[PDB]
Amino acid sequence: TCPFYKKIPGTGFTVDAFQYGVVEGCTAYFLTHFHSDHYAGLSKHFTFPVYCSEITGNLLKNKLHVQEQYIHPLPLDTECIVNGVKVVLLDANHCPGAVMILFYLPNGTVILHTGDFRADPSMERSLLADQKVHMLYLDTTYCSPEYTFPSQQEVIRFAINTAFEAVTLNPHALVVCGTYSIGKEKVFLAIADVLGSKVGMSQEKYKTLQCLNIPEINSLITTDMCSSLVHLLPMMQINFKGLQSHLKKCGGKYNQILAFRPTGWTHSNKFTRIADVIPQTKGNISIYGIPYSEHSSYLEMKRFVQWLKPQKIIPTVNVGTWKSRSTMEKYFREWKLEAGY
Ligand code: NI
């Protein structure tokens, strides 16, 4: 049944709650972003109103065939009224179209649901700064101090310089980037731009990217693989077998593959600087695991919460074990005591 941390008290609302059938007393279903653990359950047969960003609504219509009459896109950074309740959608710094939702309850309580987010100081100057938040439903994916990772900018620098060096040494090398969901588009787009290439991909992935309002996209992506030296493949195919096979498919146009797996975190991070990352190599194939995260590090999450000073925190991730839950609650108390709220 629908868990409590997906229900917004004092409203008829649920968030990311599409896999439970008809939720009792839900008048409006919010969707924070287009990732499968969150949208699981939506299809063309859904007939309740869905509230979401413009980008998320493009993906619902084109990829899942949800009928347009049930899709209610809202502009960001704008006060809107839904079933008599004031709401605002804020950029979540997650994947394209990902939002946080501010709810202004009729009794005066204010609730922020972060969806999935990567906290950033820029958030401290949105409409969040303008009022107090009583309850926070928090993306706690990496709520433990061992989770450090570099900025997204440093990781893109590393990838660009690595790709550019490899292809300038060998003009017959192919660069491959793994994907399984929207998000992390900067990785493959930054590499293609430095190589003066388009990014080649399957028709299904090209379709997905055409839903995202990325400026100048027709200039950066293509379904003609042959004309491209950056290819996108399913994350599952980024291993020595899958890449040896793909290399056969290019008809002797290429004699080397350099491939990137954008992982979230990997325990190489507890010991290693980004500068120090090395690939796994077999023959003429090398695979780099790079720590490109679209979730908060532990320090970024702590800073955001100590800035916000919520009266109550409700975790939405890692809530399935008592040891996880107890750990997170200990960190929330530390943060509150250190900051003085
Ligand atoms: Ni997500």
Swiss-Prot record:
Tissue expression remark: Expressed in brain, heart, kidney, liver, pancreas, placenta and skeletal muscle.
Domain of life from the UniProt record: Eukaryota
Induction: During mitosis. The mRNA encoding this protein contains an internal ribosome entry site (IRES) in its 5'-UTR. This 5'-UTR generally suppresses translation while specifically promoting expression during mitosis, when cap-dependent translation may be impaired.
Localization: Nucleus
Functional note: May be required for DNA interstrand cross-link repair. Also required for checkpoint mediated cell cycle arrest in early prophase in response to mitotic spindle poisons. Possesses beta-lactamase activity, catalyzing the hydrolysis of penicillin G and nitrocefin. Exhibits no activity towards other beta-lactam antibiotic classes including cephalosporins (cefotaxime) and carbapenems (imipenem).
Family: Belongs to the DNA repair metallo-beta-lactamase (DRMBL) family.
Subunit structure: Binds constitutively to TP53BP1. Binds CDC27, which is itself a component of the anaphase promoting complex (APC). Binds PIAS1.
UniProt-recorded name of the protein: DNA cross-link repair 1A protein
Covered residues, full protein: 700 to 1040 of 1040
